[PDB]
Nucleic acid binder design. Structure first.
Ligand SMILES: Cn1c(Cn2ccc(C(F)(F)F)c(Oc3cc(Cl)cc(C#N)c3)c2=O)n[nH]c1=O
Lengths: 536, 407
DNA sequence: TTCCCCCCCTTCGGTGCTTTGCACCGAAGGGGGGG
């Protein structure tokens, strides 16, 4: 019965909502009378003109419209910072899942705020004497009251482990099941002392247990069956559902790719047009279904051992990790396909995936795993020593299984003897949006090509392109644009722009390349000539 | 002591980053004892404000200290820190000989906090695997890290220091956050005993209180030019580019005779002999670079920006400036202890050294421009941090291709 | 006349330079998980 109230107010500068009164009157009150029998709903006089849009559903159901009150209620901090994950659950000998019913209907709301959650059925005006369903502050207040109730019991019993998630308790113990039933009985009695009507035998469970897409067996765990829709005419909505289901199922199924399935979503107009699939997307979906065809399982945590988060590369910006504590007995499986930045190579994506796995594992288990990256230590040293950022990877070993990540081409550090030198430049007019890109070598050979709808950066990159076309194996390109040199220095593998892609395709073939920057419009050797050519 | 926000700003609403199990279960065992003796009291959902919190280990003392990220609450209540009362920076501390750093944070654990303001200083201890909702807390006594606390305790600290200051006026006393800089001209052997005497005197005031930094060694480094007899075309091009880039910072820089020296489309490698006119021009340029930059002055109204570059081989460079292309200070940091351990480490002690230098010299922490990706910094900057302050930083993404400070 | 928490991709706007294009980041829209 007694639960201490929590202060609740409104955002300053306005009163409660007041929507027009609505003109069921006796049949629906019978349901509400039962609430008035216990004390869920009270009697409000005409001195409280606040009103909310009433609404009644037929349950297969007062779905009250709170949106104005929901908007004007003061800010409540969202203390639920995540969702418990099965892979972080320690193997408990005895388990019991309690589903607290009448959760929001047994927490008293503060007397000052009661008048705002009004209800109009004309007389008698209703007000929610308890925590309303769908209100903004209901989850936080209920969760904090549950924590305040459950803290003394957890202090009394240290070996009992209780996971709370909104309106549900999950209790585990190393005790024998005969004593575990007893301990659950004292837990239920203590909970019922405070007015919470915890079920005694109706909803208590025995293995397997069920949670959000989570079947929990005595010594394993798995997702609930993910049925991927099968159809011949896929619209965008079905593609979105497919992508979501595959992303959810990737938590335990290894080897999932959804990049080509999502690429079809690009360019669509509305949520109804039918987008035909390609061969890439169809093959990827067939592979996903045929790897999802067999059942796979996870394992629970074990603090006595060390996590080991392997990483593999599935080709063209897709990575997969299998966090485990025992070989071939996974704890968790994931995937990293996010590509940030328009110009990156494989090592940058690998270290991004490493940081992602580190933060996920700190969230879930509490300690960073021992990575086994598919990268040679010498390659990582070469990358991180000669690069302008501060890249780190916590602790790792090497995995000798291809495909293997490595740097592709190495720009030379010093000018190379006996090889040709090219002076490239491009210029594009601001208004006409037309330009020209050209180069002058040391032998006096000059070549220029007009270009259309290419700006200064574009035409500078095309000048680099011509220099790489017309040169030999070794070459020294000299530029005056900072952007071009910056793009080519970071040693990218692939880029969203195709011009950078072909530049990289040529840099792969060349044996030795050196790029040097010189200031523009200041008369440095061949810059005058290559600017006179583009100044025509 | 009433405390108020700056009107028209919402309170701190920053989310808590995930923490290691060791850090979480040390934070819990610190916060329990803090709550037992009234320092912090639990709070409910109705408090909509939150600031991060995380555990560090100072000087590897095997014990754990608790930092609360107050970088936003300070930005809100800068009025209580710069308008109400802020201690002016002693101008003589720039030229001092040796300074020691002490912590008087525990001395701040006695002054009660403003009754209305407490609800803003709320933090949250997370839980592993989201087992239970994060245990929330709020502060009841003055907090260690908020710039309002030095403003409140300035009078009390001054009354504490008046006997020792009067007895020994030679030492210069400065206070930033809850840290104290004591600056002595005495010998190194006696300076330590004098600092121990100061600590004992602080103890004798009923307030408990728990390194020989030498400010005078900090001088603006001069940018240097290459020097060799056989100047290749590529090296002459690099020199001309460097002179162009330095023409902004030094108005007297002139590069014209070398421009006439490079006329033909010559190869970058073949040696081009350098005449006597260019030798005279190089000598004059080095003479100009011998003098320091002219025109840089410190304006307390504007903010300090500190840029960091990585030169590889465990070398970093920093430039503290207010108006762009006019560096208020330049430097270089190098340590082989980080490289054997990590690389974000090197950056972390680099930031600590820069911020300590700027507090001692100017009197306020710079806004950093780190050369690091945000995720790999926010993940790992708590494992090596050891200073009870946290300067504001922004991350750079465009590569600083210039890197002409060390060519 | 359902409220939120969390993840993933895609598109839009702000933002700072690289300076008027280009490359970042975050916030919004779909999906997924239900509680
Ligand atoms: C099955 N199982 C286990 C695994 N296990 C271990 C500890 C707990 C604890 F009581 F701590 F919550 C469990 O209760 C939960 C927790 C969560 Cl997030 C979801 C669900 C569901 N549906 C049940 C639990 O399922 N150990 N031994 C055994 O048979």
């Amino acid at each position: 019965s007694p639960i201490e109230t929590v202060p609740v107010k409104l955002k300053p500068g306005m009163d409660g909502p007041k929507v027009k009164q609505w003109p069921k009157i006796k049949a629906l009150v019978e349901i509400c009378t039962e609430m008035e029998k216990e004390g869920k709903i009270s009697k409000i006089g005409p001195e409280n003109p606040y009103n909310t849009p009433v609404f009644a559903c037929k349950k297969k159901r007062k779905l009250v419209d709170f949106r104005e009150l929901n908007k004007r209620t003061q800010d409540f901090w969202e203390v639920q910072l995540g969702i418990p994950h099965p892979a972080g659950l320690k193997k408990k000998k005895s388990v019991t899942v309690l589903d607290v019913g009448d959760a929001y209907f047994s927490v008293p709301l503060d007397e000052d705020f009661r008048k705002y959650t009004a209800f109009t059925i004309p007389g008698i005006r209703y007000q929610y004497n308890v925590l309303p369903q769908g209100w903004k502050g209901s989850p936080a207040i209920f969760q904090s009251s549950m924590t305040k109730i459950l803290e003394p019991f957890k202090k009394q019993n240290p070996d009992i482990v209780i996971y709370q998630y909104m309106d549900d308790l999950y209790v585990g113990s190393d005790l024998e099941i005969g004593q575990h039933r007893t301990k659950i009985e004292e837990l239920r009695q203590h909970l019922l002392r405070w007015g919470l009507t915890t079920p005694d035998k109706k909803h208590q469970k025995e293995p397997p247990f069920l949670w959000m897409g989570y079947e929990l067996h005595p010594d394993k765990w798995t997702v609930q069956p993910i049925v991927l829709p099968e159809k011949d005419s896929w619209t965008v909505n079905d593609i979105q559902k497919l992508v979501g289901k595959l992303n959810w199922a990737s938590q335990i199924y290894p080897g999932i790719k959804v990049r080509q399935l999502s690429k079809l979503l690009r360019g669509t107009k509305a949520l109804t047009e039918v987008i035909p699939l390609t061969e890439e997307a169809e093959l990827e979906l067939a592979e996903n279904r045929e790897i999802l065809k067999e059942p796979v399982h996870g394992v629970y945590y074990d603090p006595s051992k060390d996590l080991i988060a392997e990483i593999q590369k599935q080709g063209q910006g897709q990575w997969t990790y299998q966090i485990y504590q025992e070989p071939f007995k996974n704890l968790k499986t994931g995937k990293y396909a996010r590509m940030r930045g328009a110009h990156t190579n494989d090592v940058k994506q690998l270290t991004e995936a490493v940081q992602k796995i580190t933060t996920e594992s700190i969230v879930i288990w509490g300690k960073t795993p021992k990575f086994k990256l598919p990268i040679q230590k010498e390659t990582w040293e070469t990358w991180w020593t000669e690069y302008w950022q501060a890249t780190w990877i916590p602790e790792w070993e090497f995995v000798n299984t291809p495909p293997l990540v490595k740097l592709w081409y190495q720009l030379e550090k010093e000018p190379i003897v006996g090889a040709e030198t090219f002076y490239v430049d491009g210029a594009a007019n601001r208004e006409t949006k037309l330009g020209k890109a050209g180069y002058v070598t040391n032998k006096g050979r000059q070549k220029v090509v007009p270009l259309t709808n290419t700006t200064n950066q574009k035409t500078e990159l095309q000048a680099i392109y011509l220099a790489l076309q017309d040169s030999g194996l070794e070459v020294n390109i000299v530029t005056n644009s900072q952007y071009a040199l910056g793009i080519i220095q970071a040693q990218p593998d692939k880029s969203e722009s195709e011009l950078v892609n072909q530049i990289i395709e040529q840099l792969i073939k060349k044996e030795k390349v050196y790029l040097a920057w010189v200031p523009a419009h200041k008369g440095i050797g061949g810059n005058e000539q290559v600017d006179k050519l583009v100044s025509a | 002591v009433p405390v108020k926000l700056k009107p028209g700003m919402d309170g701190p609403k920053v989310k808590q980053w995930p923490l290691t199990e060791e850090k979480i279960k040390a934070l819990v065992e610190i916060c329990t004892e803090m709550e037992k003796e009234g320092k912090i009291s639990k709070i409910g959902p109705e408090n909509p404000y939150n600031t991060p919190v995380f555990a560090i280990k100072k000087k590897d003392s095997t014990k754990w200290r608790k930092l609360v990220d107050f970088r936003e609450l300070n930005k809100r209540t800068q009025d209580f820190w710069e308008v109400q009362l802020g201690i002016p920076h002693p101008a003589g501390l720039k030229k001092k000989k040796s300074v020691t750093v002490l912590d008087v944070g525990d001395a701040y654990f006695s002054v009660p906090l403003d009754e209305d303001f407490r609800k803003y200083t709320a933090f949250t201890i997370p839980s592993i695997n989201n087992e239970t909702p994060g245990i929330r807390y709020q502060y009841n006594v003055l907090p260690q890290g908020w710039k309002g606390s030095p403003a409140i305790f300035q009078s009390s600290m001054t009354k504490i220091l008046e006997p020792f200051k009067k007895q020994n006026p030679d030492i210069v006393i400065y206070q930033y956050m809850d840290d104290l800089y004591v600056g002595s001209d005495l010998e190194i052997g006696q300076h330590r005993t004098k600092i121990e005497e100061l600590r004992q005197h602080l103890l004798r005031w009923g307030l408990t209180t728990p390194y020989e930094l030498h400010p005078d060694k900090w001088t603006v480094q001069p940018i240097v030019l290459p020097e060799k007899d056989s100047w290749t075309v590529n090296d002459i091009q690099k020199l001309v580019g460097k002179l162009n880039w330095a023409s902004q910072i030094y108005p007297g820089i002139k590069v014209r005779q070398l421009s006439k020296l490079l006329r033909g489309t010559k190869a970058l490698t073949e040696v081009i002999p350098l005449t006597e006119e260019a030798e005279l021009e190089l000598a004059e340029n080095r003479e100009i670079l011998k003098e320091p930059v002219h025109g840089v002055y410190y304006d307390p109204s504007k903010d300090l920006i500190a840029e960091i570059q990585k030169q590889g081989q465990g070398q970093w460079t920093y430039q503290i400036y207010q108006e762009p292309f006019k560096n208020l200070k330049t430097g270089k940091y190098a340590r082989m202890r980080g490289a054997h351990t990590n690389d974000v480490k090197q950056l972390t002690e680099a930031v600590q050294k820069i911020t300590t230098e700027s507090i001692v010299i100017w009197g306020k922490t710079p806004k950093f421009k780190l050369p690091i990706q945000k995720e790999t910094w926010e993940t790992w900057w708590t494992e090596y941090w050891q200073a009870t302050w946290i300067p504001e930083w922004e991350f750079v993404n465009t590569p600083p291709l210039v890197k002409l400070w060390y060519q």
